[PDB]
Amino acid sequence: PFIYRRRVQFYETDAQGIVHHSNYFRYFEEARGEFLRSKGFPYSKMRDMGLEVVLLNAYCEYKKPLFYDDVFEVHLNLEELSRFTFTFSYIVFKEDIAVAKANTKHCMVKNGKIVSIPKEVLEVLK
Template identity: 45%
Template structure:
């Protein structure tokens, strides 16, 4: 197992936020967000983060690189419901030569009263478009040393 990050429930511990409105299609028969959708929320926030730092995922692909998910972990704390506006807090956590980890916190509420609904971690490798493992882009390795 590569997972080495323990995500916190404090929004102040995360460097980036992304808001998403829960769609009806993401809920199950009980009216709550199906557990599988949390990984999609993490992915949407991750793609927005990469664009925010000036390296959109399209740039990776144009350079012949991919960042497949090697592991993922989610702790479900409170259910999400249709039409909730969630904030996905994201932080680049651990970076090695060929992998990186991102920590996530999903909250609902205003800045002065945010309730943690989930935490999670994704571990990513770096491969060529052909699937061969390769080193991370230099800019990402540098971000991990800050």
């Protein structure tokens, strides 16, 4: 898997003393960005071409909480890649333990229209 390792910041918690559920999606976005950066085609360069990566749906299942200052890892895997869309899966680990699992499906946009994924992008995703 591609691994993104991250520490919980205080502002990411809520009054329950855990990381708020909505912030997991932010962590997944950070992981996707580092995935692309690490492969040498950062999302920022995609945006310079006039490409947008559009989120279609997202799912997260929450098994155990994350606390302030916990070190955790998001292990990302490409699940599906078609002409128009791609799907990532994510497992969030803390110590030995899967603390959450998720997935996100995406498509791509240029000049206000859905475009098939450029071969240059297929290369880094694959």
